[PDB]
Design brief:
It is classed as hydrolase. The structure is a homodimer. The first copy, chain A, contains 15 helices and 18 strands. With 532 residues, chain A is α/β, with parallel strands linked by helices. The complex binds ligand TZ4 (2 copies).
Chain lengths: 532, 536
């Protein structure tokens, strides 16, 4: 019974487990409950704080994964399976994990809180790519990660009702945040230095905590990797949320809000998941059935509106994208694309993929996208049209929303650092043409190349150390730059004037200017006026 | 006769002519200047199609340039060489339908290819007697026979009340066609080969050449064509029948000829020439640049349909065309009514002035389309750089009016059977008096193609002299063979045809030919495939 593995938190006593990291032991406290299981009548409701417990709670394993759709596009394939649930599925899933140095840090350490992505319909804090181990052991960080409800469970909303007000998955997150504020001190963590970081839907989540006043006193810094609270996919309106909730209710046999939610609550979880794909208004990619809703409660107005008008002066933010944001979404319903062939495409296939990539586009709007993305020297080259189809999806959903977010925060007094991640993992099982797809920087930031038995190159081990240093340096100080190192070159702040960002690849830092500036101007400034 | 130089006495279908022996740097040339090719289009003939010149008696004197067709004399910058070199250099008169011929001295023993020049000036100005259109250098150095004609401009050439018999429109083009007929019948008397005639022209001259290509009765009058910085398609070279009727009618009112066509045209015919010129600007529907009041009309006769339609559905197999542009097509146009611009300062403008310019530069464009133009042309790293905005304003005008129509033209012609050669001219004359910011402006290749640098007394650099020799060879090789390349020469880089596949075109500057690919491809896709659909 190792005294280092015994913590007293507000709700009782905990037993963690000593884990092996390449360079030494870490303490891990996995599966800590932070909310009353949101089950039975509590489905679709705000989470409630976990009641105190007797004795000593076993916090040595990851707990169940929140109920969610399981991907079967390529059964057995590592490139998809690595994102699938690695624990039993259950509605009883509100548990968080904490990693700390062993021994318990002596003095107050910066806390990193991870919020996973998965399009608000999937994900878990227990996947191997979110292993806190290395950041704990190498960088001396306390690193926290929580589960939050996804799909219908987290985000089904009949806006303005009592029983399903929406945004509960975000509320789950906020509860984990309050838990950290209330308990982390006991692990050696520093509640006055909390850095949120997350990817894709996790980044939009972070974005939303930035944009929601009650969340603001629970953290000090934010990192948005490949996702934003603004943009076409991260939110729906109250009208549109009601529509889908109402259509789902119908689809599962449920005939007045109270009546509807009651009948929805009687339904086995898998019934809800069986019918969640079917509520989307159009054939599309990079659109998800149940996402945060603009309720006037959690989100007091649209993110677009909120980012345009907020005051961001005492706020530091790190944002960025991967080289090929859209490639991986193409194999999920764009005719012509597959991981098993080189996916070279006709022009007609391109116009079609654009209607699906930009579901809200009119004929003229779609024709503009097409005309903008065509290479007029090689206007019918199958390689370009493929790379362009990808680019359309990446730019429209991630890169240009990121550019806009970074723009507004800088303008309004936030301190912003931007990046583009351009290294393709050697261990990667997706085809070359996909490049560096959505999600594949995470293993590097988390430092998985430090585990020698994962067969990463020596170059990649070093790169991972550099990235761990940027993220944790940023957590300590709000500046990713190493405060005791020279030469560098330095990573400069993103500003609206200079628009400086850096590339994270195997080479040392290179400073560039303008994040797809011409193209984003099309997406952020033109198209809105067009489809109007 | 008796004591005259026997090389200068030539008979044509209308009678005897006496020419003049002129000194070119390298030797003498023969010139027959001011040959009448039409009945003077005065009095009751104003606005009417031209009638063939009636035979004269005796030996007509053809030693000097004749009158320049009635036109607006530029007064933007009085005394400034930059504008005055384009201004008329003979008396203004409605009696102006004359042409000029330069041939080697002595006239060549065997039939020589003929080059026919058609001046520009926005269809409202110009004269074949300007110093930069001097055929003596091409005549002496390349052994060419060169012809240039006056044709009516402004109201006199292009005022139309479409459907009427008294003012049918396009009569300026018909002047040009009549001179082409003249060349067919008469050019052999000078040693020219009527079976080998190449039209060339710049700006409106180019657009006119294009219209001869698209107008069937003109097709049997020439074999090859060169379009410099202008096209029949595009926003300025033609007007609908409706628009030309509105413009003729409005002008009539302005000069006190109120609204039946016959009565109106009759009253217009009583007006003094200068009152028509004093009022021709006032009929433009918007504040604008690169728009001219009386231009070719789409009449269902000379033009059987819009040039856009005719180039889309034309068969151009048996046709060779050389086409091209200068580096800075739009720059010179900015000083003619874009607030913020001038030749006497660096013309550094603001973002406000740019948006205002775009409205003027693209006058037919809705708010949404103007926004589109501005968004496309903004440099988003420096959306407020004065220098960049100035150069973008220039490019907006350049691309919309010349570069993208040329591209469009080269594209459609090549896809439909034409051998098309394409260029971009990048040399700024060392002698230019327009400010450096204007780059190589609209019109400033002409003096090189005509070989003015060979005149030692014109203060051109030695490099420029060589450059002009080169260009003269390209143009005449093209007249001679339909290929600008020299047969005997050997890389010495080749000029490849422009195709839809490769989109090849050469740079013309002091360095040897460099092949480039894509005549401003992305941006022109904007003007040619996007903007149309936004103004639907
Ligand atoms: N027959 C069905 C029934 C239900 C659903 C269906 C299909 C599909 C679907 C599968 C294949 C082709 C078309 C459609 N889908 C899939 C549509 C969702 C497509 C997004 C997949 C994706 C792709 N990426 C980028 C690549 N890397 C990742 C992943 C995955 N997750 C993550 C999470 C975080 C970061 C990265 C990452 C998951 C899958 C693959 C790659 N993220 N997410 C479902 C979705 C629902 N919301 C509801 C029900 C179902
Ligand atoms: N206050 C008045 C009264 C009447 C007219 C007015 C203004 C103008 C005008 C002058 C200054 C600023 C704005 C408007 N204008 C001028 C309108 C602008 C059109 C001329 C500008 C221009 C500019 N370029 C390019 C530069 N190189 C050339 C030129 C010119 N000619 C040629 C001919 C062929 C090739 C090149 C070339 C003539 C002028 C300067 C440069 N070509 N043409 C008139 C025109 C009419 N048809 C009738 C009346 C008047």
């Amino acid at each position: 019974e190792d005294p280092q593995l015994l913590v007293r938190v507000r709700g009782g006593q905990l037993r963690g487990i000593r884990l092996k990291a390449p360079g030494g032991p870490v303490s891990a406290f996995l599966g800590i409950p932070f909310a009353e299981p949101p089950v039975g009548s509590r489905r679709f409701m705000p989470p409630e704080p976990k009641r105190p417990w007797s004795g000593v709670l076993d916090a040595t394993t990851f707990q169940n994964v929140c109920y969610q759709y399981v991907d079967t596009l390529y059964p057995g394939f590592e490139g998809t399976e690595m994102w699938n649930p690695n624990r039993e599925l259950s509605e009883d899933c509100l548990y968080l994990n904490v990693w700390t140095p062993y021994p318990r840090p002596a003095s107050p350490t910066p806390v990193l809180i991870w919020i996973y992505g998965g399009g608000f319909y999937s994900g878990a804090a227990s996947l191997d790519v979110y292993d806190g181990r290395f950041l704990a052991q190498v960088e001396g960080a306390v690193l926290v990660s929580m589960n939050y409800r996804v799909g219908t469970f987290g985000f089904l909303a009949l806006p303005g009702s009592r029983e399903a007000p929406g945004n509960v998955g975000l509320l789950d997150q906020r509860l984990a945040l309050q838990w950290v504020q209330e308990n982390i001190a006991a692990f050696g963590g520093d509640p006055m230095s909390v850095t949120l970081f997350g990817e894709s839907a996790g980044a939009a989540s972070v974005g939303m905590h930035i944009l929601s006043l009650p969340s603001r006193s629970l953290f000090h810094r934010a990192v948005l990797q490949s996702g934003t609270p603004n943009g076409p996919w991260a939110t729906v309106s109250a009208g549109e949320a009601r529509r889908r909730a109402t259509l789902l209710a119908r689809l599962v046999g449920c005939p007045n809000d109270t009546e509807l939610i009651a009948c929805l609550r009687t339904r086995p979880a898998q019934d809800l998941v069986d019918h969640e794909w079917h509520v989307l208004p159009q054939e599309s990619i990079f659109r998800f059935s149940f996402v945060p809703v603009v309720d006037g409660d959690f989100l007091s107005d649209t993110p677009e509106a909120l980012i345009n008008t907020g005051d961001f002066q005492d706020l530091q933010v790190l944002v960025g994208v991967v080289k090929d944001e859209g490639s991986a979404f193409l194999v999920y319903g764009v005719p012509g694309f597959s991981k098993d062939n080189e996916s070279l495409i006709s022009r007609a296939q391109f116009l079609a993929g654009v209607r699906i990539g930009v579901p809200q586009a009119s004929d003229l709007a779609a024709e503009a996208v097409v005309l903008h993305y065509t290479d007029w020297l090689h206007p019918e080259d199958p390689t370009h049209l493929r790379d362009a189809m990808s680019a359309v999806v990446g730019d429209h959903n991630v890169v240009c929303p990121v550019a806009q977010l970074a723009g507004r925060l800088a303008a309004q007094g936030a301190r912003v650092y931007a990046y583009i991640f351009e290294h393709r993992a050697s261990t990667l099982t997706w085809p070359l043409w996909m490049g560096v797809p959505h999600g594949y920087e995470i293993e590097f930031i988390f430092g998985l190349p430090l585990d020698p038995s994962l067969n990463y190159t020596t170059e990649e081990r070093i790169f991972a150390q550099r990235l761990m240093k940027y993220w944790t340096n940023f957590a300590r100080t709000g500046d990713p730059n190493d405060p005791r190192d020279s030469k560098s070159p330095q990573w400069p702040p993103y500003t609206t004037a200079a628009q400086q960002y850096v590339s994270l690849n195997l080479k040392p830092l290179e400073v560039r200017r303008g994040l797809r500036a011409q193209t984003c101007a099309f997406w952020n400034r033109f198209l809105p006026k067009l489809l109007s």
